[PDB]
Amino acid sequence: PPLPSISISHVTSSSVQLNWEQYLLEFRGDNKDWIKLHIPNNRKSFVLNGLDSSRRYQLRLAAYNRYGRGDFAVIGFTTAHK
């Protein structure tokens, strides 16, 4: 089970877009507990909406197969202002 290569874009005051090449996606406000996100299969991108502005978050993604999941690829970001 491999390590996804993830890429962030479209960083707004309330959302970010993740791109990469079953999954487990989680996010958290900085230093808080992780929240598991629903993402459908056969998706290669994901828009996380509903975030606060000017705030630090982390996203992490791991890939799944029948044997289990791999390690998490993590990205920290700060949403835009206003």
Residue numbers in the entry: 495 to 515, 527 to 587
Per the authors:
Recently, a shortened Dscam (sDscam) gene family with tandemly arrayed 5′ cassettes in Chelicerata species has been identified, which encodes ∼50–100 isoforms. Chelicerata sDscams could be classified into two subfamilies, sDscamα and sDscamβ, containing one and two variable Ig domains, respectively. Crystal structures and cell aggregation assays demonstrated that both α and β subfamilies of sDscam used Ig1 for the isoform-specific trans recognition in a hand-in-hand manner. Furthermore, the cis interactions were established by the three FNIII domains of sDscam, which assemble into a cross fold with a kink between FNIII2 and FNIII3.
We found that FNIII2 alone but not FNIII1 or FNIII3 could promote cKIT tyrosine phosphorylation, suggesting the essential role of FNIII2 domain in mediating sDscam cis interactions. The gel-filtration analysis supported our observations in the crystal structures: Ig1 mediated the formation of trans homodimer and all the three FNIII domains were involved in the cis interactions.
